[PDB]
Amino acid sequence: AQFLDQLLPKTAGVSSPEQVLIEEIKKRHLATASGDCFEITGKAYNIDPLILKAIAWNINKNGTYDIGIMQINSSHLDLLSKFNISEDDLLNDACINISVAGYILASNIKSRGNTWDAVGAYNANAVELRRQYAMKIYKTYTKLKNNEQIID
Numbered sequence: 001a002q003f004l005d006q007l008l009p010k011t012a013g014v015s016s017p018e019q020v021l022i023e024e025i026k027k028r029h030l031a032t033a034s035g036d037c038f039e040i041t042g043k044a045y046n047i048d049p050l051i052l053k054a055i056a057w058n059i060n061k062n063g064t065y066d067i068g069i070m071q072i073n074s075s076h077l078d079l080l081s082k083f084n085i086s087e088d089d090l091l092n093d094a095c096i097n098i099s100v101a102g103y104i105l106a107s108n109i110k111s112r113g114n115t116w117d118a119v120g121a122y123n124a125n126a127v128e129l130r131r132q133y134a135m136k137i138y139k140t141y142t143k144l145k146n147n148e149q150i151i152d
Contacts, residue, residue, distance in 0.1 A: 003116055004117040004130065005115055008114050008115060010048040011047045011109070011114055013109035014045055014106055017045065018103070021102075024040075024099040024103075025084075028096055031095075037094060037098045038052050038053050044102060047102060047105055050141055050148065055070055055071070056069055057144075060073070068091050068094070072090055073123075080100065085100065101122075
């Protein structure tokens with residue numbers, strides 16, 4: 001179909017993003033207390049870890065801003081406070097940041113389908129900016145996948 005309607009590679013999502021986030025944050029608080037995050041998150045939310053990496057390796061127009069390694073949009077902070085995830089946690093713990101990004105993408109997949117449109121929505125006028133963003137991620141993704149196939 002159109003790009004935004006084609007399927008994300010090796011990515012199914014989960015039926016309940018919220019339930020997974022709760023479990024993931026628990027596991028990461030314990031691991032910090034017990035004294036690769038892209039892989040852990042990709043497996044927990046059934047997202048290809050290279051899509052997460054592609055997002056990592058790439059103030060907004062509407063006045064929101066981006067936070068930490070996965071550039072979590074500030075519009076999520078209010079929802080995240082209900083999970084006891086603060087802005088400071090997103091800034092000082094890359095693994096929590098990535099688990100949250102997984103949650104957001106997974107929500108997008110539940111909402112839009114497991115298509116490039118779900119990745120476009122991660123950033124977000126709207127339709128075209130989603131497309132440009134998804135295309136950026138798609139390009140980095142293919143490079144990361146290509147490289148990975150060679151060295152495996």
